[PDB]
Every structure is written in structure tokens, then in C-alpha cells.
Design an enzyme around this catalytic site. Structure first.
Site, PDB file in Angstrom:
ATOM      1  N   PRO B  89     -16.897   3.830  -6.418  1.00 28.35           N
ATOM      2  CG  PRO B  89     -18.489   2.859  -7.527  1.00 28.35           C
ATOM      3  CD  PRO B  89     -17.459   4.411  -7.919  1.00 28.35           C
ATOM      4  CG  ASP B  90     -14.343  -2.463  -2.302  1.00 28.46           C
ATOM      5  OD1 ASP B  90     -14.372  -2.732  -2.963  1.00 28.46           O
ATOM      6  OD2 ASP B  90     -14.833  -2.451  -1.319  1.00 28.46           O
ATOM      7  CG  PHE B  91     -10.281  -0.406  -6.478  1.00 25.54           C
ATOM      8  CD1 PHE B  91     -11.091   0.625  -6.353  1.00 25.54           C
ATOM      9  CD2 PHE B  91      -9.011  -0.605  -5.643  1.00 25.54           C
ATOM     10  CE1 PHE B  91     -10.490   2.148  -6.566  1.00 25.54           C
ATOM     11  CE2 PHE B  91      -8.645   0.558  -6.470  1.00 25.54           C
ATOM     12  CZ  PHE B  91      -9.501   1.685  -6.458  1.00 25.54           C
ATOM     13  NE  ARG B  92     -12.506  -5.428  -1.579  1.00 25.58           N
ATOM     14  CZ  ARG B  92     -11.379  -3.897  -0.697  1.00 25.58           C
ATOM     15  NH1 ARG B  92     -11.081  -4.661  -0.080  1.00 25.58           N
ATOM     16  NH2 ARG B  92     -12.516  -3.145   0.162  1.00 25.58           N
ATOM     17  CD  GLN B 163      -8.429  -1.285   4.100  1.00 27.57           C
ATOM     18  OE1 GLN B 163      -9.434  -0.469   3.604  1.00 27.57           O
ATOM     19  NE2 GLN B 163      -7.566  -1.902   4.566  1.00 27.57           N
ATOM     20  CG  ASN B 164     -10.332   4.973   0.562  1.00 24.51           C
ATOM     21  OD1 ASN B 164     -10.570   4.091   0.972  1.00 24.51           O
ATOM     22  ND2 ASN B 164     -11.654   6.123   1.927  1.00 24.51           N
ATOM     23  CB  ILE B 165      -5.341   5.262  -3.801  1.00 24.05           C
ATOM     24  CG1 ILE B 165      -6.292   5.185  -4.374  1.00 24.05           C
ATOM     25  CG2 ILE B 165      -4.909   4.042  -3.315  1.00 24.05           C
ATOM     26  CD1 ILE B 165      -6.147   4.071  -6.164  1.00 24.05           C
ATOM     27  CG  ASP B 166     -10.547   8.447  -1.727  1.00 22.47           C
ATOM     28  OD1 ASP B 166      -9.792   8.935  -1.114  1.00 22.47           O
ATOM     29  OD2 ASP B 166     -10.882   7.839  -1.853  1.00 22.47           O
ATOM     30  CG  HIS B 181      -2.935   0.277   0.095  1.00 26.04           C
ATOM     31  ND1 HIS B 181      -2.352  -0.685   0.702  1.00 26.04           N
ATOM     32  CD2 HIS B 181      -4.158  -0.163   0.966  1.00 26.04           C
ATOM     33  CE1 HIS B 181      -3.458  -1.977   1.269  1.00 26.04           C
ATOM     34  NE2 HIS B 181      -3.797  -1.603   1.584  1.00 26.04           N
ATOM     35  CB  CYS B 216      14.325  11.291 -17.810  1.00 27.31           C
ATOM     36  SG  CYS B 216      14.579  10.023 -15.711  1.00 27.31           S
TER      37      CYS B 216
HETATM   38  C1  LIG Z   1      -2.485  -3.290  -2.707  1.00 28.02           C
HETATM   39  S1  LIG Z   1      -1.608  -3.231  -3.142  1.00 28.02           S
HETATM   40  O1  LIG Z   1      -0.373  -3.102  -1.756  1.00 28.02           O
HETATM   41  O2  LIG Z   1      -0.102  -3.809  -4.121  1.00 28.02           O
HETATM   42  N1  LIG Z   1      -1.247  -2.071  -3.339  1.00 28.02           N
HETATM   43  C2  LIG Z   1      -2.208  -1.971  -4.486  1.00 28.02           C
HETATM   44  C3  LIG Z   1      -3.371  -0.460  -4.701  1.00 28.02           C
HETATM   45  C4  LIG Z   1      -4.826  -0.835  -3.662  1.00 28.02           C
HETATM   46  C5  LIG Z   1      -5.622   0.499  -3.133  1.00 28.02           C
HETATM   47  C6  LIG Z   1      -5.985   0.938  -2.549  1.00 28.02           C
HETATM   48  N2  LIG Z   1      -7.367   0.328  -2.308  1.00 28.02           N
HETATM   49  C7  LIG Z   1      -8.742  -0.374  -3.073  1.00 28.02           C
HETATM   50  N3  LIG Z   1      -9.690  -1.585  -3.112  1.00 28.02           N
HETATM   51  C8  LIG Z   1     -10.682  -1.205  -3.086  1.00 28.02           C
HETATM   52  N4  LIG Z   1     -11.605  -0.625  -3.306  1.00 28.02           N
HETATM   53  C9  LIG Z   1     -10.724   1.107  -3.279  1.00 28.02           C
HETATM   54  C10 LIG Z   1     -11.515   2.225  -3.214  1.00 28.02           C
HETATM   55  C11 LIG Z   1     -10.422   2.982  -3.090  1.00 28.02           C
HETATM   56  C12 LIG Z   1     -10.367   4.728  -2.752  1.00 28.02           C
HETATM   57  N5  LIG Z   1     -11.901   5.432  -2.348  1.00 28.02           N
HETATM   58  O3  LIG Z   1      -9.311   5.290  -2.592  1.00 28.02           O
HETATM   59  S2  LIG Z   1      -8.525   2.678  -2.721  1.00 28.02           S
HETATM   60  C13 LIG Z   1      -9.212   0.916  -3.071  1.00 28.02           C
HETATM   61  C14 LIG Z   1      -7.074  -1.750  -3.294  1.00 28.02           C
HETATM   62  C15 LIG Z   1      -5.391  -1.594  -3.668  1.00 28.02           C
HETATM   63 ZN   LIG Z   2      12.973  10.807 -14.552  1.00 23.70          ZN
END
Ligand SMILES: CS(=O)(=O)NCCC1CCN(c2ncnc3cc(C(N)=O)sc23)CC1
Ligand SMILES: [Zn+2]
Ligand SMILES: C[C@H]1CN(C)c2ccc(-c3cccc(C(F)(F)F)c3)nc2N1C(=O)Nc1cccc(-c2cnco2)c1
Ligand SMILES: C[C@H]1CN(C)c2ccc(-c3cccc(C(F)(F)F)c3)nc2N1C(=O)Nc1cccc(-c2cnco2)c1
Ligand SMILES: CS(=O)(=O)NCCC1CCN(c2ncnc3cc(C(N)=O)sc23)CC1
Ligand SMILES: [Zn+2]
Lengths: 335, 335
Positions: B89-92, B163-166, B181, B216
Site C-alpha cells: 500500500p501507499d505509505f500515506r 519514487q519507489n524503494i521496493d 529516493h 568495522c
Molecule cells: C522523502 S525522502 O527523500 O527523505 N526519502 C525517504 C523515503 C521515501 C521513500 C519513498 N516514499 C513513499 N511514500 C509513500 N508511499 C510509498 C510506496 C513505496 C514503494 N512501494 O516502494 S515508496 C513510498 C516516500 C518516502
Molecule cells: Zn563499517
């Protein structure tokens, strides 16, 4: 943007056919049409450009009170909205009578049957139960009513075309009135058309007894005193047309207050007057099918209260916080 | 029409300040401002005309597939939307992690703390609980991912800014990728920055044990292996700028899929390219602050499925009923 309107109704689960009852009156679409098709028809109609385009030099609430205090010869269209605060819900709302049909009126098949002359002749029992709910001398006129009444005292009102049958315009003392769907003011017999005043029949109705004609033979069953409300099957009052004939070329300001403008003949008025005539909207919700120069959105009384405050003088003596959406929309309390 | 957007949020009870977190990043509005004022500020920003106006000769889904099959050098922007069907799900959103903060992450004060380098150095326990939820090798890529992957095989993809980190783009086999990101692909130590692959650290994380740097001194506590996700406090990947520098003058088609475009730097891209470059939107909901030439609304997979079907050939082999709103909006299943 008809998107909002459609999407809103898509999640709610509205029958598009009943929408088309308004968008296409006097046309029954064939029953083979699936709802996906009926919706695209709806969209196709709403997305059509309106006859009367918006005047671009008129936008703000400041523009609105300027027009209000400068204009004589004003036309006001009022719908179910101006009476909700008085205690009468819109028939089409959730606490209204159409939605209360199975609860309080199981005899009625349609909402239509409530005001159908063919059903009324069959069975007037359910109409008079309802009549006691909204009978004159049970509700006080709203701030909007009194406002319109004041404009009429001041000589500014060319006409108030109302859709309401509650006769609150009567109570408020509004003179130059046109009741498009009739009113409870009088009641005529179906047979001999003997006319009478409402405050008379009050007693008969308040005691769940059907009023019959004192002059007809008692043998006659259709000898019934019916409040001169325009039922399905009956013609409109011919005075509407006589009034509108003159008004359209003498109106310099049109105000829509508390009406969806879903229902003819009032729904037709905004596109039946000169396009240079300024049109202002006061309503809980914006209208998908019509463009107004200034759109004031929220509780009708709340808005009138602001304008009355702004107009000062006599209008301020009626008085008992918005957001601006450029170029011409305002959001008050209500939605 | 920013009316729909505002009214929607007014009944829901949204803090306008958190809206302004997006509309005015790098500006903290003073705390003396009441919410009625903050809302008018919001409206004032949204009602501003967008930098990039809509191309009027481009409107239909037919126009869209034409551009798709004709264009090389395509840029695709993807947000949280392309992964919801995969199980993330969307984080938001309501089942997302921000709303689950008090439930599953009571240690965290802010949603921000989840990705704040200052909090992570204090306490990385809550980040790795979350990391196990969305860790690579738990979800399969969506139809949208595979679609983008196919466009890349076909040589049409200039870049996919996600934008995804998945790291699902990785799994889908998308080559020309830019993870704005960052991602879970690698993990570096905070101290010595020794880098490593995700499939390695998998075991440590799946057993609720914090990965530390094998090189380390064990005496060191900050010797932690952190997935190279861009945390608050840290700079963006410098490759984003290097990529965008070239891409903006070589892009001939921009597709936004499954993103609100609330968050910089991706949010800036639609207004950072030539205005004659066609822009298409694929999303569950339309965007108040940006104008697109074609707007396809509903479930992202459902829409891609239609286009894939239309494009035929290779794209059709990916395949596993709309309403048209003139001149350029389509409503699919979803809202
Ligand atoms: C905003 S930042 O530069 O400091 N980096 C901080 C972390 C971000 C990661 C991307 N973001 C998301 N935000 C909301 N929903 C989702 C769903 C995602 C997925 N399926 O990968 S990533 C994601 C925001 C934060
Ligand atoms: Zn280290
Ligand atoms: C979706 C298109 C093509 N499709 C989807 C249709 C398929 C059937 C019909 C249709 C057929 C018979 C009767 C009707 C009826 F008008 F609803 F009664 C509509 N209408 C349409 N469509 C219409 O647009 N119908 C329609 C019907 C009536 C008025 C309008 C219209 C559109 N803009 C101004 O008026 C449009
Ligand atoms: C309601 C008007 C006048 N009022 C209601 C205000 C009262 C206070 C502020 C204000 C004061 C200090 C800081 C800020 C802050 F920008 F939010 F940080 C706003 N802004 C506005 N207003 C703004 O429009 N502020 C504002 C603030 C920032 C950007 C914009 C803007 C509007 N269109 C493009 O940018 C507009
Ligand atoms: C449509 S017709 O020509 O055949 N005449 C039939 C009866 C109409 C009466 C007016 N209508 C209303 N409809 C919905 N809500 C309201 C609230 C009212 C009020 N406070 O007086 S009147 C009203 C419609 C039916
Ligand atoms: Zn009689």
C-alpha cells in the site's frame, strides 16, 4: 468539470436512468440500453456547452452585492433549498418523503403517485397524510424568504419563481410571486371546481378526515377538495408563461437560491433570458449543467446573512468565514 | 477545478498544514496562522496557472496509443501506485505504514522518523521491522512494471524515474532506471561505507537481527548496514540530476503512472521539460496542480491492460468498459 458529478454518483450507485429523467424529460430511453451506455449519454449531455455562457467581467461576492444594490427588476428562482432550515427536507433527500416512501407511505407505488392525478382519484388517503406534515401554520419562513420579501417591499423584485408548494412565500409576505408547481393556498373540487381557502380545510386535514365538496351530491365520491398543486397529468399554471413572456425582456438580474434546477419549467429559465443578464448562484452544491457568473456555495441562510450584512441598511436588520476559489466560487458553511 | 479537491478535504478534516508540506516544501508557515488562512493559501497556490499548459491537439486514448507506438525516447514517472496491486500500500494510505504508526511502530514519533538519519542513528530497530514487510523476494512486479520493462526491451524507454524503494523495477528487469529516493538493492555501512547486496542481508533481517559491518570494530555501535535509501538529512542521488540534465532535451513523451506527484524531485519533472512534449496521466485520481493532455483514471493495471490490448503485438502478450469525459478524461474501474 462533469467528472466530479459522475464519479460521485458512480460510487454511490445511482441509477443513471433517473438522472436522465431530468436531463431528458419527455423522452423515455429504450430498456435494452445497459447502464454503461446510459452513463455515457448522461456525460454527453452535461459536456455539451451551455446555451448561456458566463459573463467574465462579473466574478466576486463584491460584484454580487453591487449588482444586488444597484439592480431593480430582479428575478429570483427558489427551490426546495430555501425551506430545509424551516423544517421541510427536500423530497429527494434522505430524510425526505421519496426516501420515506416504504416507511410512511406503503400504499404508494411510485414517488410519482404522490402527485399523480390518476392515483389521487383512486386513493387520496396517502396525499393528505403527507399534506399534514407540510401544512401552512407549522413552519416559519427562512432568512431567505424574508430577504426576498424585503426586496419586494423595496421594489426590486420583478418576480420570484418558486418551485415550492409549502406556501412559505405567502407567509413571508412576498407579493410578486409565481408558484410554478402550485401551492396549498387554495383547494378546488375535482368535479365542480368550487374553490376555498387553506385555513378552512386545516381542521379536516389535521384530524385525518378527507375534505369533500359541501356543494356536490354526497353520492359522488370524486367530490374531493384538492389543494391546487399541479399534479402529474395536469397542465402548468398558464400564468407562468404569461409572467415569463414579459419578465425575460425586463429582467436585469437573476438569482438562483436553493434549487438544483433539475425540474422544468424553472430549470429552463436561466437559458431563456438574455445572456448579458448577470446570473448568481446560491446553493449547497454547484450545478453541472449550468454556468453562473458568481457561485456562492453553502447553507443558503448563512450566505444571505453575509450579503444582508454587506448590503447594510434594511437588509442588515434581518441578520440573526468563507473561502475564495478564483475566479468566482465561494465556500461557506455547508457543502 | 480545485473546488472538488478542497471541499473533499474539508469534510474529511485534513490538516491544511500537511498539504502545504507538499505545496510549499522548504517553507515552514508561521504557527500563528489559523486553518481558515492556511486553506486560502492552499487554494491560492493550486489556482495559480501551471507552468506547462495542456496541448489541445492531443486528447483521446487513441491519441495516447498513437504516441506510445510512435515515440522512442519515452520518460515514465512511477509512484506508489504501481505497487499497490503487488501487495504494497501507499505509505500515506489507510492501510499504509504512516497510518499504522501507532499500531505497529509505537517507538516512532513521526512518520518522518522512519526515514530520518538522526533517528536511525538513535534507533534502527523500527526501520528493519518495516524493511521485512516490503523486502525484495516477497512481491511480484505488476502489469505496469512488466509494461515498462517491455518498453525498455523495445528501445523506447529514455528513462523510468521511480519514487519507489521496493526495487520492483529491478525484479521486473527494467534497465534504464533512476531510483530517486534510493532502494533496497544495496546497503552501506554508516562508518566505512562498505557496500553489499540485498539478498545477502536478507537472512539477518528476516530473523529480526540488525546487520552490522563485518569489517568495522565490533566496539563501534554506528557500524550498521543501511539500505541505500535516501533518508531525511541526506542528499539526493547525484545521478538524478545527471540523468535529468540530458533527458529533458531528448524526451518526446512523458507518462505519469501511479503517482500523486506530491514529492520532489519527481513532482518537478512535468514542469521541467519542453511544453510541446505530450504528457499522459495514468492514476486512480486526477491531479489538482498539474495539467495533462490525456488523463486515464482508474486502476493502473486495468488501464495498462487496455493500452497493451490496443497496442497489440508484444504488449498484448502481457494482458491477463470505460467512460469518456470530453475532451480528454477517461474513467476506468477505480477512482
Ligand atoms: C522523502 S525522502 O527523500 O527523505 N526519502 C525517504 C523515503 C521515501 C521513500 C519513498 N516514499 C513513499 N511514500 C509513500 N508511499 C510509498 C510506496 C513505496 C514503494 N512501494 O516502494 S515508496 C513510498 C516516500 C518516502
Ligand atoms: Zn563499517
Ligand atoms: C453514447 C452515445 C452513443 N451511444 C453511447 C448511444 C447509444 C444509444 C443512445 C440512445 C438511443 C436511443 C435513445 C436514446 C435516448 F435519447 F436516451 F432516448 C439514446 N444514445 C447514445 N449516445 C448518445 O450520446 N445519446 C444521446 C441521447 C440523447 C441526447 C444526447 C445528447 C448529447 N448531447 C446532447 O444531447 C445524446
Ligand atoms: C491568503 C493570502 C493572504 N493571506 C490569506 C495570507 C496570510 C498569510 C500568508 C503567509 C504568511 C507568512 C508565511 C506564509 C507561508 F508562505 F505559508 F509561509 C504565508 N499568506 C497569505 N496568503 C497567501 O496567498 N499566501 C501565500 C503564501 C505562499 C504562496 C502563495 C502563493 C499563491 N500563489 C502562488 O504562491 C500564497
Ligand atoms: C412535478 S409536477 O409538475 O408534476 N408537480 C408535482 C409536485 C412537485 C412539487 C414541487 N416539488 C418538490 N420536489 C422536491 N422537494 C420539494 C420541497 C418543496 C417544498 N418545501 O415546498 S416542493 C418540492 C416537486 C414535485
Ligand atoms: Zn364539488
Amino acid at each position: 468539470g462533469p467528472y466530479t458529478f459522475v464519479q460521485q454518483h458512480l460510487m454511490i450507485g445511482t441509477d443513471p436512468r433517473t438522472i436522465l429523467k431530468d436531463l431528458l424529460p419527455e423522452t423515455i430511453p429504450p430498456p435494452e440500453l445497459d447502464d454503461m451506455t446510459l452513463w455515457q449519454i448522461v456525460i454527453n449531455i452535461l459536456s455539451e456547452p451551455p446555451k448561456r455562457k458566463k459573463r467574465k467581467d462579473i466574478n466576486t461576492i463584491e460584484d454580487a452585492v453591487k449588482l444586488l444594490q444597484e439592480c431593480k427588476k430582479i428575478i429570483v428562482l427558489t427551490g426546495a433549498g430555501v425551506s430545509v432550515s424551516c423544517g421541510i427536507p427536500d423530497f429527494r433527500s434522505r430524510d425526505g418523503i421519496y426516501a420515506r416512501l416504504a416507511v410512511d407511505f406503503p400504499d404508494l407505488p411510485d414517488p410519482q403517485a404522490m402527485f399523480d392525478i390518476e392515483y389521487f382519484r383512486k386513493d387520496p388517503r396517502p396525499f393528505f397524510k403527507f399534506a399534514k406534515e407540510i401544512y401552512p401554520g407549522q413552519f416559519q419562513p427562512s432568512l431567505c424568504h424574508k430577504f426576498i420579501a424585503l426586496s419586494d417591499k423595496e421594489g426590486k423584485l420583478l418576480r420570484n419563481y418558486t418551485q415550492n408548494i409549502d406556501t412559505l412565500e405567502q407567509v413571508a409576505g412576498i407579493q410578486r410571486i409565481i408558484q410554478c408547481h402550485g401551492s396549498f393556498a387554495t383547494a378546488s373540487c375535482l368535479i365542480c371546481k368550487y374553490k376555498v381557502d387553506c385555513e378552512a380545510v386545516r381542521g379536516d386535514i389535521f384530524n385525518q378526515v378527507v375534505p369533500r365538496c359541501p356543494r356536490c351530491p354526497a353520492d359522488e365520491p370524486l367530490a374531493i377538495m384538492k389543494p391546487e398543486i399541479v399534479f402529474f397529468g395536469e397542465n402548468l399554471p398558464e400564468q407562468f408563461h404569461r409572467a415569463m413572456k414579459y419578465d425575460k425582456d425586463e429582467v436585469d438580474l437573476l438569482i438562483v437560491i436553493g434549487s438544483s434546477l433539475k425540474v422544468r419549467p424553472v430549470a429552463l429559465i436561466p437559458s431563456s433570458i438574455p445572456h448579458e443578464v448577470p446570473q448568481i448562484l446560491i446553493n449547497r452544491e454547484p450545478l453541472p449543467h449550468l454556468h453562473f457568473d458568481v457561485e456562492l456555495l453553502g447553507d443558503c441562510d448563512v450566505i444571505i446573512n453575509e450579503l444582508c450584512h454587506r448590503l447594510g441598511g434594511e437588509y442588515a436588520k434581518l441578520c440573526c468565514q468563507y473561502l475564495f476559489l478564483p475566479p468566482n466560487r465561494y465556500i461557506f458553511h455547508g457543502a
